[PDB]
Amino acid sequence: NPLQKARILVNQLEKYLDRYAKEYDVEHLAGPQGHLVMHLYKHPDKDMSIKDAEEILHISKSVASNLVKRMEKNGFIAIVPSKTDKRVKYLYLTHLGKQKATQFEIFLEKLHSTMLAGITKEEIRTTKKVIRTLAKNM
Amino acid sequence: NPLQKARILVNQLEKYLDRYAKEYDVEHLAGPQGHLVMHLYKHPDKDMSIKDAEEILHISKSVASNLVKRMEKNGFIAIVPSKTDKRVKYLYLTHLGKQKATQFEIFLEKLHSTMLAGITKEEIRTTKKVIRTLAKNMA
C-alpha cells in the first residue's frame, strides 16, 4: 500500500537524518537554521534582513523572528538593526556560523550523493509536485 | 518541520482512504485484490491462472498464491484447478466479486475526483519510484 510505505519511509527518513547530522556535527543546525546559515554563507555580497529570511523560508514574521533569535542565542549569527528604519534587522554569520556553514555544505553534499542516488531531478520536481497537490487536495 | 508535515499528510490520506472504502463498501479491495478483481471483471473472455496473477501484480507465485487464497476466503473468487492440467489453478469472479468490481470502480473514481485530483497516473508512478529508491538509499 503506497500510503503505508510512505508512512514507513518518513519514519526511516527522520532516523536517517538525525544519525547523519550527528556524524557531521551539525545536529542543531539541521533544518531551517541550516537553510538560513547556508544562504548567508553562499551570498556574501548580499545582506539578509529578517524579511529576507521570511521570504526564503516562507514563514511569518513572528516565526522568523524567534528563529533568528534562536540562531543568535546559539552563537550562529549577529543580529544588527538597521540605523535608518528601526524595524529592519540584518543577519550576519559569526565565526562559528561560518565554520558550521562550510561543514553543513559537506553534510548536504553527501546527502544529495546518497539519498538522491538513482533519482533524476525531473523525478524530484514531480514528486514535490505530487506532494503539494495532495496537500492542496486536503 | 517538513517530516512532521509529511507524516500529517500521509495520515490525512489514509483517513480519507478508509472513508471512501467504507462509503463504497470495498475496504478489502484497496490494493492488489481490487486490482485483480478489476482485471477479471474488465477482461471476462480470458482466463486468469495464478501465474497470470504473478505477471499482472508483479509478485511471486508464493505471494500470489496467498493473495488469491485470501480473496477466496473473502468470497471474491473461486479457485478452480485446471481439469486439463494438474499444475494450473484458475480464478473466476463470483457473483459477489462482480458487484465489488463496480463498487470498486466508483471508489477509484472518487479518489481521482477528490484526493488524487490533478495527479496523472505517470506522476503517481514516479512518486512511487522515488519512494522506493529513497528507502533503498537509506540501507
Numbering used by the authors:
A (entry chain B): 3 to 140
B (entry chain A): 3 to 141
Extract from the study:
In the present study, we conducted structural and functional analyses of the heme-responsive sensor protein PefR (porphyrin-regulated efflux regulator) from the β-hemolytic bacterium Streptococcus agalactiae, which is the most common cause of life-threatening invasive bacterial infections (e.g., septicemia, pneumonia, and meningitis) during the neonatal period. This architecture of PefR is similar to that of the multiple antibiotic resistance regulator (MarR) family of transcriptional regulators, in which helices α2–α4 and strands β1–β2 form the DNA-binding domains.
Gel filtration analyses showed that apo-PefR eluted as a single peak with an estimated molecular mass of ~35 kDa, indicating that PefR (ca. 17 kDa in monomer) exists as a homodimer in solution. We observed structural distortions by the N-terminal His tag by comparing the X-ray crystal structures of apo-PefR with and without the N-terminal His tag.
